[PDB]
Subunit: 121 residues, 4 copies
């Protein structure tokens, strides 16, 4: 649980996700994107189910990155929603929503959707 | 900004979203859902753009709730992604993803998607 | 059902959706978008459940528009997925995915998601 | 274009997608799901960009299946939105929305989202 999730993760684009899972269900850490208007690390914070079912199911979790740090601001935020799966091939499988700030007129085009799979590599 | 976002919000389902926005970009608070396998408040945490553009654009933000508290655990988590819009009729417009724990064979059906609009008045 | 769905619909952006529902479950018509890189009508095609439950549940449906017509080509396509709800205030509530052609390096940013609500009155 | 898309496709779950692309941008065919409340083939219909950019970009397309056929009805419909990518490893990369009919009270839980990658295998 806590131990399985804590540590470094990499996704299929080469991005780096460093996270600490608290016994209380907290996720905290940093994210570094291999793509987009991003450089160096960004703060992340999220939550995970700290007492998952014991029927073979994954562990639900989610986190957010606002794409502002000391280097740049891309006026956007991404949330990843998914589940942690344990085993020899531990994975965090996610889908994500990236919203950027828009005028109300352009609200219809404010949100991208995609999917990331993270491995300990 | 920080002052605009902090406080109590309500969505179209009758859910209650209570949040404090930090100067650093943090969001912290609690969420109470009017629907689903949920009761009472749940911890939420997230992030918002603490230095948005000044061109009339909204403020990007997101937050997460894991649906476990001292009363219930629905083995699932929702992330809201959207933007805060100031002015007279302040709103937070979001789309969300709800993932629940599944077996690997059932992963394809693990995630719901929807949209919530939050305002300051009941 | 077939009679309820067939005809002209309007969404919250001012777009116009004209559709014919077939007895077999087919949807055929045209879409005119009030926003984006689009002008005039575009062909749409899709499917709906021609034998829905009779328990008060909505009618599932979906359709696709590729944003090429005789005037413009925006190298993109939108799919709407949702349900038709009958009764006095008939609506089609949808969420949509818009994908545009990208290079492989840019695929991660190829798809927008949103929601449209269609009604019969302007 | 037309030739690249037409034919049989398989996704990562083992589902089978048989499609004919028309010169006019039409997609027609059948879908057979390896999972869910589904058996045998279902009608599909969709659209694709019949004159894509020539800058290396993929070909945008989308299609719908309503999960009713002569065998069963699952009171739901899935739309796939994505792009066709040519080459030695031709792929149709998609994201999808599955909506099932619900009461208005339960509308909030009516729609699933996911992703499918199709190959000619
Ligand atoms: Cl069992
Ligand atoms: Cl104004
Ligand atoms: Cl009623
Ligand atoms: Cl160039």
């Amino acid at each position: 649980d806590e131990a399985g999730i804590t540590g470094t993760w990499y996704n299929q684009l080469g991005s780096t996700f460093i996270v600490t899972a608290g016994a209380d269900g907290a996720l905290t850490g940093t994210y570094e994107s291999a793509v987009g208007n991003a450089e160096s690390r960004y703060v992340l914070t999220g939550r995970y189910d700290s007492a998952p079912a014991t029927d073979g199911s994954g562990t639900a979790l989610g986190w957010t990155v606002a794409w502002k740090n000391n280097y740049r601001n891309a006026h956007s935020a991404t949330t990843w929603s998914g589940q942690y799966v344990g085993g020899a091939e531990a994975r965090i499988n996610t889908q994500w929503l990236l919203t950027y700030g828009t005028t109300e007129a352009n609200a219809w085009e404010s949100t991208l959707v995609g999917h990331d799979t993270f491995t300990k590599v």
